[PDB]
């Protein structure tokens, strides 16, 4: 697995934290996604064709914003 951290914007509540996990989990190649609500960060484990930029697009499409750390 490869791993990447994303900084998250718009995650004001734990419902939205779950929304972000669900959106990231749908990305082909994602194996696991740990959303840290307190730290406004997601740790994503992946393989396959996943890229950091496909991950931040998933977050955008779900109605939030991410940036690659």
Binding residue numbers for a metal cation = 13, 16
Which residue lies nearer to Zn ion by CB, 13 or 68? 13
Q: How many CA atoms lie within 13 A of 63 on its CB side?
A: 8
| Residue ranges in contact with Zn ion by CB under 5 A | 12-13, 16
- Rounded Cα distance, 2 and 56, in Å: 16
Least spacing, CB of residue 23 vs Zn ion, in Å: 13
Which residue lies nearer to Zn ion by CB, 50 or 66? 66
Collect all residues with Cβ–Cβ distance below 8 Å to 57 and sequence separation of at least 6: none
Residues belonging to the binding site are 13, 16
């Amino acid at each position: 697995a490869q791993t990447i951290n994303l900084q998250l914007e718009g995650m004001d509540c734990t419902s939205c934290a779950s929304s972000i996990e669900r959106a990231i989990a749908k990305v082909p190649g994602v194996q696991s996604c740990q959303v840290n609500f307190a730290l406004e960060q997601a740790v994503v484990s992946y393989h396959g064709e996943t890229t950091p930029q496909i991950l931040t697009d998933a977050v955008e499409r779900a109605g939030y914003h991410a940036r690659v750390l």
